[PDB]
Amino acid sequence: LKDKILGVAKELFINGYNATTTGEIVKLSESSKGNLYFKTKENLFLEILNIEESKWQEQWKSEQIKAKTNREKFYLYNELSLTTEYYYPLQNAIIEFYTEYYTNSINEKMNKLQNKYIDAYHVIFKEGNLNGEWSINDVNAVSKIAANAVNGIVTFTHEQNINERIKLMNKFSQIFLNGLS
Amino acid sequence: NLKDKILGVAKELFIKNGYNATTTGEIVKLSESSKGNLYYHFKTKENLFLEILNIEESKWQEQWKSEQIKAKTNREKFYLYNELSLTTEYYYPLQNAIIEFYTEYYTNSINEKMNKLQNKYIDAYHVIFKEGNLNGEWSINDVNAVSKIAANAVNGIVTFTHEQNINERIKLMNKFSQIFLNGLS
Ligand SMILES: CCNc1cc2oc3c/c(=[NH+]/CC)c(C)cc-3c(-c3ccccc3C(=O)OCC)c2cc1C
């Protein structure tokens, strides 16, 4: 029954973490105070990141076959990253959470959510070493970089023409990938 | 000095209490000023904050100009700048008040000046890349884009890697600086 609440949450969060609150989440939704018990707010929010992280991650599975090689897949995952409505449009809300509501158990809990977000790149780079497109020496490192680099392009340019955004991402994808060969 | 005092008191107020918490009345009283003189200079708390952010911006470029003497070549400069940016986040106090503000207003009016404010930060790369071209450290026939990219690539690495110990994160950032810079030839 209580799956309805998440829609108002995902919606509201993408106003921010601070601005949205347990009151708004219930009253603007119609559900008892107790019924919402994921116990804490940071347990609710952290749950939403997974449903959106998964949604994106299965959209990428459904769209990546168009990329024939791994080199194309890298370009594409980064392009698609800009256009998706999953995960990446919450990233602002995380930055607040990252640097405010962080209990020590929450840190370790959502580190698994981090490792999920790199595995897109981990698979790609490993497969490149396999399919013979390049030779990475420390992949899990190079993935952490490519990912966070990319997240940077996506998040910190949410205020200009979308055709341009894609061009800058493409250029990055090209530079980065070339730095490995 | 009543303008500068307000900015100065506002800053330390924001640092201690955060954007949303700090009130105009507090700023007014503690700087021994008046709501009028505040409205005259700044109009809104929204704007006052931007002026602080611009003062700090200039302190940064001032700081950089001094620190970059340490790095001889433009290759070295690029490495060092990206490091400095990474180390910063750990102890910059306005950090938290900036995240509040940034998310509370990104209004096409307020967002206008926030963009103009990042262009000064991008101009740092723009120089490094430009000057590297002239000494022949690389060939970039498109210095403005690659500047935009580098800026946001670094900022992404700084901001979205708040789990590891500082040793590891400097190791990553330099590995990025290595890969990126390498793939320009
Ligand atoms: C020892 C002095 N250390 C400094 C450290 C700083 O760290 C910053 C970290 C950040 N971390 C991510 C949230 C963001 C956004 C801005 C920062 C600024 C900053 C603030 C206002 C305007 C521009 C900048 C800025 O960095 O750009 C200047 C060109 C900043 C400024 C100074 C002086």
User: Which CATH number fits the domain that encloses residue B20?
Assistant: 1.10.10.60
Report yes or no: B78 and B138 within 8 Å, Cβ to Cβ: no
Do A108 and A156 reside in the same domain of the chain? yes
Q: Which residues of B53-79 are buried (b: 16+ CB within 10 A; e: fewer)?
A: beeeeeebeeebeeebeebeebbebbb
Q: Which long-range contacts (CB under 8 A, 24 or more apart) does B125-132 make?
A: B125/B78, B125/B81, B125/B150, B125/B151, B128/B74, B128/B77, B128/B78, B128/B81, B129/B74, B131/B74, B132/B73, B132/B74, B132/B75, B132/B78
Q: Which of B31, B49, B67 is the last residue of a domain?
A: B49
Tokens 């096409």 map to which residue? B108
Q: Which residue range(s) make up the domain with B156?
A: 50-185
Q: What does the alpha-carbon distance between residue A17 and residue A97 come to, in Å, rounded to a whole number?
A: 7
Which of A15, A108, A156 has the most B C-beta neighbours within 10 Å, making it the best mutation to test the interface with B?
A: A156
Report yes or no: A97 and A45 within 8 Å, Cβ to Cβ: yes
User: Which CATH number fits the domain that encloses residue B167?
Assistant: 1.10.357.10
For helices B74-89 and B166-182, angle between their N-to-C axes, nearest 10 degrees: 150
Do B76 and B116 reside in the same domain of the chain? yes
Residue B101 contacts by C-beta under 8 Å, 6 or more apart in sequence?
B19, B49
Cα angle, residue B153 at apex, residues B91 and A85 outer, rounded to 5°: 105
- For chain A, the farthest-separated pair of C-alpha atoms sits apart, in whole angstroms, at 58
CA distances from B56 to A99, A177, B117, B120 (A): 21, 35, 11, 11
Within a 10 A sphere around the Cβ of A160, how many other Cβ atoms?
11
A179 alpha carbon – ligand 1 mean position (Å) = 28
Is A50 exposed, middle or buried (CB count within 10 Å of its CB: 0-12, 13-18, 19+)? middle
Q: What does the alpha-carbon distance between residue A126 and residue A146 come to, in Å, rounded to a whole number?
A: 14
Do B111 and B79 reside in the same domain of the chain? yes
Q: What does the alpha-carbon distance between residue A70 and residue A136 come to, in Å, rounded to a whole number?
A: 13
Do A145 and A172 reside in the same domain of the chain? yes
Do A165 and A115 reside in the same domain of the chain? yes
Do B81 and B131 reside in the same domain of the chain? yes
- What residue's CA is closest to ligand 1, atom 27? B121
Residue A44 contacts by C-beta under 8 Å, 6 or more apart in sequence?
A5, A9, A25, A36, A38
Give the gap in angstroms from C-alpha B26 to the nearest C-alpha of chain A: 22
Do B156 and B85 reside in the same domain of the chain? yes
This structure's resolution (Å) is 3.2
Structural domain total, chain B: 2
Do A141 and A177 reside in the same domain of the chain? yes
Q: CA B16, B19, B21, B27 torsion: positive or negative? A: positive
Do A148 and A171 reside in the same domain of the chain? yes
CB pairs under 8 A between A and B: 104
- C-beta of B79 in contact with ligand 1 (< 6 A): no
Report yes or no: A16 and A92 within 8 Å, Cβ to Cβ: yes
Do A134 and A149 reside in the same domain of the chain? yes
- What the block records as the tokens of A110 is 């959502």
Do B169 and B83 reside in the same domain of the chain? yes
* Helix (H) and strand (E) counts in chain B: 9, 0
Dihedral angle over CA of A158, A160, A166, A168, nearest 10: -100
- C-beta of B98 in contact with ligand 1 (< 6 A): yes
Q: Is A167 helix (H, G, I), strand (E, B) or coil?
A: helix
A125 DSSP assignment: H
H or E segment to which residue B73 belongs:
none
Experimental method: X-ray
With CA atoms as reference, report the closest residue to B158 among B103, B93, B95, B87.
B87
Give the gap in angstroms from C-alpha A62 to the nearest C-alpha of chain B: 26
Do B94 and B71 reside in the same domain of the chain? yes
